[PDB]
Amino acid sequence: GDALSYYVDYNRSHRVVLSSELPQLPDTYFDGDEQYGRSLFSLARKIGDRSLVKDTAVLKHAYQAIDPNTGKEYLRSRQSVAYFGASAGHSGADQPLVIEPWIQGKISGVPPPSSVRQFGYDVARGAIVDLARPFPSGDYQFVYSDVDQVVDGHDDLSISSGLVESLLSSCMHATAPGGSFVVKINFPTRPVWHYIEQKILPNITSYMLIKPFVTNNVELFFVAFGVHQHSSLTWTSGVYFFLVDHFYRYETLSTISRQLPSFGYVDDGSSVTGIETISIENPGFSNMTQAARIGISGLCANVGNARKSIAIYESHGARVLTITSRRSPASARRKSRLRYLPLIDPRSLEVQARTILPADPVLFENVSGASPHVCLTMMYNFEVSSAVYDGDVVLDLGTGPEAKILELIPATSPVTCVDIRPTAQPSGCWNVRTTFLELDYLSDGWITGVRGDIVTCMLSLGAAAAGKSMTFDAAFQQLIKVLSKSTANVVLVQVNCPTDVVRSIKGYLEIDSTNKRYRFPKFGRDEPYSDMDALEKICRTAWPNCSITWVPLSYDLRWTRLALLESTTLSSASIRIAELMYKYMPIMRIDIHGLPMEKRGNFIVGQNCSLVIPGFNAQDVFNCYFNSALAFSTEDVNAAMIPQVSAQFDATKGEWTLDMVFSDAGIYTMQALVGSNANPVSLGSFVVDSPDVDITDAWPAQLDFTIAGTDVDITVNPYYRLMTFVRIDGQWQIANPDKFQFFSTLVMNVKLDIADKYLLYYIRDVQSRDVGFYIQHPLQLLNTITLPTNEDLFLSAPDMREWAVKESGNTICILNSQGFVLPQDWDVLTDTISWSPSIPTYIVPPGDYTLTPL
Numbered sequence: 132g133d134a135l136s137y138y139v140d141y142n143r144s145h146r147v148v149l150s151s152e153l154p155q156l157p158d159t160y161f162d163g164d165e166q167y168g169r170s171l172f173s174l175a176r177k178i179g180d181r182s183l184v185k186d187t188a189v190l191k192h193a194y195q196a197i198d199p200n201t202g203k204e205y206l207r208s209r210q211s212v213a214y215f216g217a218s219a220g221h222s223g224a225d226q227p228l229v230i231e232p233w234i235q236g237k238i239s240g241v242p243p244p245s246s247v248r249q250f251g252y253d254v255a256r257g258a259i260v261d262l263a264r265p266f267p268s269g270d271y272q273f274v275y276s277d278v279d280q281v282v283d284g285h286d287d288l289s290i291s292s293g294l295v296e297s298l299l300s301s302c303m304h305a306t307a308p309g310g311s312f313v314v315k316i317n318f319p320t321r322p323v324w325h326y327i328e329q330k331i332l333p334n335i336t337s338y339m340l341i342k343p344f345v346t347n348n349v350e351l352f353f354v355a356f357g358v359h360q361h362s363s364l365t366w367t368s369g370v371y372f373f374l375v376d377h378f379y380r381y382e383t384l385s386t387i388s389r390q391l392p393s394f395g396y397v398d399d400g401s402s403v404t405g406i407e408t409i410s411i412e413n414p415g416f417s418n419m420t421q422a423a424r425i426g427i428s429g430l431c432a433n434v435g436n437a438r439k440s441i442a443i444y445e446s447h448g449a450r451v452l453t454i455t456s457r458r459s460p461a462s463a464r465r466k467s468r469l470r471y472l473p474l475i476d477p478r479s480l481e482v483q484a485r486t487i488l489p490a491d492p493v494l495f496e497n498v499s500g501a502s503p504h505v506c507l508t509m510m511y512n513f514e515v516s517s518a519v520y521d522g523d524v525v526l527d528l529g530t531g532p533e534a535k536i537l538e539l540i541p542a543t544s545p546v547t548c549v550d551i552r553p554t555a556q557p558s559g560c561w562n563v564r565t566t567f568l569e570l571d572y573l574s575d576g577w578i579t580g581v582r583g584d585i586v587t588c589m590l591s592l593g594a595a596a597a598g599k600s601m602t603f604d605a606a607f608q609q610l611i612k613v614l615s616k617s618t619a620n621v622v623l624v625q626v627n628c629p630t631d632v633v634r635s636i637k638g639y640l641e642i643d644s645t646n647k648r649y650r651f652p653k654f655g656r657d658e659p660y661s662d663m664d665a666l667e668k669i670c671r672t673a674w675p676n677c678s679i680t681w682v683p684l685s686y687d688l689r690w691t692r693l694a695l696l697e698s699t700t701l702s703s704a705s706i707r708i709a710e711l712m713y714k715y716m717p718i719m720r721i722d723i724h725g726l727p728m729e730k731r732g733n734f735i736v737g738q739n740c741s742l743v744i745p746g747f748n749a750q751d752v753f754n755c756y757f758n759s760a761l762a763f764s765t766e767d768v769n770a771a772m773i774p775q776v777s778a779q780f781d782a783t784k785g786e787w788t789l790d791m792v793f794s795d796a797g798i799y800t801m802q803a804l805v806g807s808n809a810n811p812v813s814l815g816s817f818v819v820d821s822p823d824v825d826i827t828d829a830w831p832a833q834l835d836f837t838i839a840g841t842d843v844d845i846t847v848n849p850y851y852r853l854m855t856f857v858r859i860d861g862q863w864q865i866a867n868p869d870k871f872q873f874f875s876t877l878v879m880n881v882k883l884d885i886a887d888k889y890l891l892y893y894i895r896d897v898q899s900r901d902v903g904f905y906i907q908h909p910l911q912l913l914n915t916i917t918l919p920t921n922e923d924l925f926l927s928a929p930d931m932r933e934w935a936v937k938e939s940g941n942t943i944c945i946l947n948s949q950g951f952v953l954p955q956d957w958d959v960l961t962d963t964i965s966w967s968p969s970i971p972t973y974i975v976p977p978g979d980y981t982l983t984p985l
Contacts, residue, residue, distance in 0.1 A: 132177075132500065132703040134184045135344040137377065138192060141337055143898045144794040144850050145367035146774050150324035153366065154374055156349065157382075160318075161285050168388040172347040175394070175495070181345050182218065186229040189341045189352055191240055193313065196339065196356070199897035202856065202863050205311060205337075205356055208242035210272035213305060215262055215298075216279070219255035226256050244273070263297040270307035280317045291318055296326045303331065308359035315352050319374075324366075331355060332364045340370070342377060347384045351377070368762070368772035369795075375760050376686060383688045387695045390460075392494075403460050404696055406492050407433065411452035415443075415484065419477045428475045430454060435462035436533055437697070441480070442489035452480070455492050459697045461538045468542045470562035500702030501694060503639060504653070506709035507716075508590075511625055513690040514682075514718060515539055515587055518623060526583030526619050528572055529591020536587075537565070547581070573599075573609050578617045586614060586622040593627050593658045593716075603627055603647065603661035608669060615673045622721045627660035629715045630681070639708055640715065649715075670721060678725030680800055680816050681717055685710045686758060720813070728801070728815035736796050737822040737848035744787035747803065749780055753787070754802040754811075793819050794850070822848040826894075826908050836883040836922050843879035851896040851906050853877065857966050858893060859930070863903075866892075866966045885975075886927045886965055887913045889982050920977055927965040927972040933985030938978050946982075 159165065178184065196205045218227050226249065229238075236243040248271070249257025260266040262278065278298055280291040295316055302312045316323065332338070336357030342350075392402045400407055409426055411419070419427070431439070434456040442453040501509075516539035519525060525546040527536050532554045540546055545564030548554065554567045570577050573595065588610065596606040607626075614622060627649065635641045641650045649658040663681070670677045684690075694701050732741035744753065755763035763771045765778050775792035793799075801814035828845040835841035845853065855871040857864045872880035892910045895903035918924060928934050934946030944954055953959065958974040965972070 134178075134188065135703050135706070136188055136192075137342045137344065137373070138340060139369050139373040140196075140339045140900055141364070142367060142369045142794075143852070145369045146772055146794070148366040148368060148371060148772075150328045150366060151321060153321070153324050153371060154378060155321045155324065156288070156318050157378070158285075160349075161282065164389065165385065168385045169347055171391060171394060172384075172388050176346065177498070178345065180222065180228055182220075183228045185343045185345060186227075187238060188343050189313070190229070190233075190238070192339065192341050193311070193354060194241060195900070196337070197897075197900050197902055198357075199854065199902065200336075200865070202854075202865055202895075202897070202902050206273060209245040211270075212244045212247045212273045212275065213268075213271040214247060214249050214257075215251065215274065215276035215302070217249035217251040217254035217257050218277075219253060226254075262301060263294065265301070265304070268305070270310075271305060272307065272310045274302050274305050274310075274312035276302060276312070276314045278315065282318070288318065288320055292320045292323050292326075295323055299326070299331055303334070303358065306358040310358050311354065311356045312358065313352055313354040315350070317350055319349065319351060327353075328366060334359060334361055335364065336360055336362050338364065340373060344380075347381065347388065349378065349381050371762065371772060372758075372760075376758070380688055383692070387688075387692050390696060403458075403463070404494075404698060405458060406455070406494060407458055408453060408455040408492065413450050414452040415450075415481060419481065424474060424477055425472075427454065427477070427480070429472055430456070431475065432469060432472050433462060433466060434458050435465045435538065436535060437462065441487060443483055443485070443487040444489055445486065453489055457494070457496075457698050461693070461697060464542060465538050468537060468561055468563070468565075471560055473557040473560040495698050495700050497700050500700050501705050502653075503705050503708035503712060505699070506690075506694070506701070506705045507712055509693050510684055510690045510709065510713060511589055511718065512539060513693055514684050515589070515623060517689070518720075519544060519585060523621075524582060524584040524619075526578075526581065526586040526617065528586060528588045530589070534567075546583075573606070573613075575613075578613055581617070583617065583619040584621065586617065586619050588622075588624045590625055592624070594656065596627075596659050597657050601659070603659045604665060604669070606659075607661065607666065611669055611673050620723045622723065624719045624721070625716060626666065626719050627658055627716055628663050628666065628719075629660065630663060630717060631714060636708065636711060640712065642715075666719070671727075674723050676723070676725055676727060678722040678728070678813055678815055680720045680722075680813050681798070682720060682800070683713075683758065683798070684718065685713050722813050725813065730817055734817055734819045735821075735823060735848075736793060736819055737850045738792075740791045740793065740819065742789040742791070744789065744803075745785055747785075747787055747805070749782065750807070752804045752809075753778070753789075754804065756800045756802060757797050796821055821905075822850045824905060826906060830912050834883060834916065834919075836919070836924055838882075840880055840882035843881050845877040845879060847877050847906075850898070852898050853894045853906070854897050854902075856893045856895055856903075857890055859890075863893075863895075864966045867964055869962075870964055882925075882964070883916065884925045884927060884964055885916075885918065885980060885982070886925075886929055888916050888918070890929050890966075918980070920979060923977055924975050924980070925960065925964065925972065926975050926980070927963065928970050929965065930967075930970075935983040935985060937981045937983070940979070940981070 194204065194206050197203065198205050214227065214230070219225055222228070230247060232238055233241065234243055234247065248268070250260055250262060250266070251257060252259060258266070262276075276298060278294070280294055282288070282291050295314070299314060302314060306312050335355040338356065339354050341352045341354065390403060392405060396402070398406045407430065409430055411423055411427075414423070437457055437459065439454065439456045442455070444451060444453070512535065515536075519540050521541050521543050523544060525536075525540060525544060527546050527548050529550065530536055530548040532552055534548050534554060534556045536546065536548065537556070543563065547566040547568060549568040549570060549572065551569060551571060553569060556567070558567060572591065592606055592610060596603050599606070633642050633644045638652060641652060642648070643650075647660045649660060667679060670679060691701065726746070729743045731743055732739055734740045747753075753765050754761060763773070763776070768776055768778060773791060773793055773795075775790065777790040779788050781787070796819060798816060798818050800816045802811050803814055804811060826845070826847060828843060830843065831841055847853070853873055855866050857866060870882045870884075892913050894906065894908045894910070896906045928946050931947040933948055936943055936946065944951065953973070956976050960972040960974050963970055963972050
């Protein structure tokens with residue numbers, strides 16, 4: 132299938148970060164075992180042209196970006212384009228593929244450019260020049276570069292990064308001022324980071340990084356906007372978030388592919404994932420005993436719970452029964468848990484009397500890809516297996532008959548799978564304590580005899596919630612009452628509880644907002660749901676010392692380790708559905724013997740938030756996580772990405788306090804370290820909402836229509852930034868840069884004009900790739916400004932209409948009509964004021980003026 136995309140943009144509120152703090156290309160990148168894993172991934176990839184899927188994706192982000200100084204698009208229709216590194220290639224296309232739809236405007240959301248040029252080392256239809264040196268050419272509104280570096284040794288990083296810096300300076304001169312360019316970087320290095328911040332960033336206005344996911348590598352793209360228009364841009368923490376995930380996905384995937392076999396290999400049972408099969412002779416006209424029974428059962432012990440299939444056919448005078456299946460590392464952990472091999476029921480394999488024609492075994496069979504739900508269960512499965520540790524006993528709850536956990540849990544951990552349907556796994560031959568019991572898990576008075584340490588409720592509560600016509604909270608309340616009797620201390624639950632506004636996944640998940648109900652159309656499964664705040668309350672009644680940690684497992688490709696190693700083909704579309712379907716059905720972790728946490732300040736983005744942490748020793752250290760990463764420590768503090776942090780120790784009582792000012796709307800989780808060996812325990816989690824929408828400002832009792840103007844005071848959370856706009860004739864326009872001046876409370880300098888009385892002025896937020904969606908305040912006070920009769924006034928026409936001015940009710944000169952003449956008492960101001968340079972500005976003697984459009 133298609134490729135995936137990851138990207139970040141310059142959030143203006145983030146902190147200042149220096150270049151050496153950002154990570155770069157790992158030391159162990161170019162190596163023999165590294166080159167194996169990447170190259171294995173490339174051959175197994177099923178895709179058409181990789182150049183087209185990468186280019187159409189990154190071009191789409193470039194266009195849609197919004198200019199604060201314009202209120203509209205960075206890149207304009209029918210602009211001039213330069214293509215660098217143009218590929219004639221070997222497709223027979225004789226030129227880059229994306230270009231011929233890009234001229235025709237066949238791409239959705241991309242208008243045709245004016246003309247396109249081609250340069251490169253091996254372009255067929257363009258001039259062949261060395262792009263690191265000057266060349267005879269014009270100036271372009273857009274530059275696209277796909278240069279690839281060349282490396283044969285780890286010491287070549289000086290030579291390769293030298294090319295990137297050289298190309299950056301040439302694309303600088305190539306772009307006309309106010310334009311844009313994009314540059315692709317194969318190998319991110321710290322000296323590259325040092326080059327970007329010092330030279331190119333101060334010259335540009337805004338930047339964005341785009342990463343498509345096609346082949347398993349660290350390739351990246353970088354874009355610069357508004358060239359030759361000096362500014363004050365620096366690195367941010369949002370950039371740091373982008374890199375740490377971008378590098379980690381390579382780190383996890385390199386190990387996944389290293390454990391896979393070579394392309395076109397030969398199987399003998401050695402490889403951890405592979406093929407295995409056996410054959411029988413003369414079956415179906417008697418009884419299979421001894422080798423027929425032992426061999427067939429012994430195969431099933433090695434393969435486990437995976438798919439199994441048979442073939443029955445005749446060849447060379449021999450009647451054969453064939454079994455083929457695919458092993459996995461997961462099957463290996465089931466293999467050791469057995470104390471000895473169990474035998475099977477051979478009746479079902481005997482009753483056949485027809486020929487089942489065989490076929491060639493395939494390793495990655497299902498080219499259909501995993502479904503979103505099959506991907507969904509894998510993420511839930513993994514977070515359970517990684518949570519369990521050796522020796523810990525488990526109170527498994529709601530598991531289906533196939534009993535997948537025996538593979539998830541370690542081999543030394545005894546557990547029991549209990550439910551309402553009899554199982555199929557054999558019940559006398561395991562090595563450790565393994566039992567199955569059939570009883571309603573919501574019944575009263577059963578757990579008191581059961582022994583367990585960790586509890587897991589996976590997809591179990593949801594269906595029986597609809598089963599007994601209850602709401603989710605009531606069904607959840609019954610489960611809570613039972614486990615309060617239980618001897619266990621760790622509970623992991625998968626809960627129907629959205630973490631965002633209710634949206635229906637079109638065709639995959641349809642939700643009623645009022646009746647708290649779910650509807651899955653692919654399965655016809657109907658379920659109820661509950662609230663995130665309330666479930667916190669339910670826990671607090673059962674345990675005075677209970678902690679909660681809503682963890683967003685999404686954005687972690689560890690689950691894919693289960694999928695790829697099990698030879699279950701993944702698809703891009705299924706993951707994108709799966710990542711969203713987690714948000715509506717997250718997993719809650721409860722620490723029964725934890726310590727309660729308290730929030731005292733106001734947790735709204737941009738406000739001052741504070742936390743209270745009692746009981747910790749002066750040598751103890753606190754740690755914060757956001758998406759399993761860490762840049763926050765009481766050890767460093769100053770390295771924390773969020774701007775304002777203060778952590779103080781108070782030995783008078785035994786309390787710690789923390790002061791935060793979060794510039795991101797993220798969910799943060801806490802960790803605490805006790806002792807010089809640092810034993811970690813899980814603390815609470817808190818959610819910070821978007822900054823206050825509210826706005827309040829003061830307008831002076833006596834105005835000031837003079838040259839120096841009057842001041843206006845505004846109080847806003849510092850995330851938003853106010854710009855002045857005018858809405859005329861279905862479009863939004865931006866006024867003069869010097870008439871309205873915003874600076875630090877948010878204090879205004881505003882010049883007063885009579886045109887303000889007849890125009891309408893708005894305020895919008897522009898700090899993002901959007902303008903005007905969260906704060907949008909009209910100035911009706913500027914619509915009706917009282918004009919003192921003794922005070923001098925300015926004037927400037929709103930537009931070229933038949934404007935007409937009457938003085939105290941008496942007519943004088945018309946405006947915007949062929950042959951306007953300045954009155955015998957007015958003046959022309961030095962500079963134009965209105966929302967157009969093509970509008971002149973006049974200085975008028977005091978009076979009572981009335982304007983009229985004709």
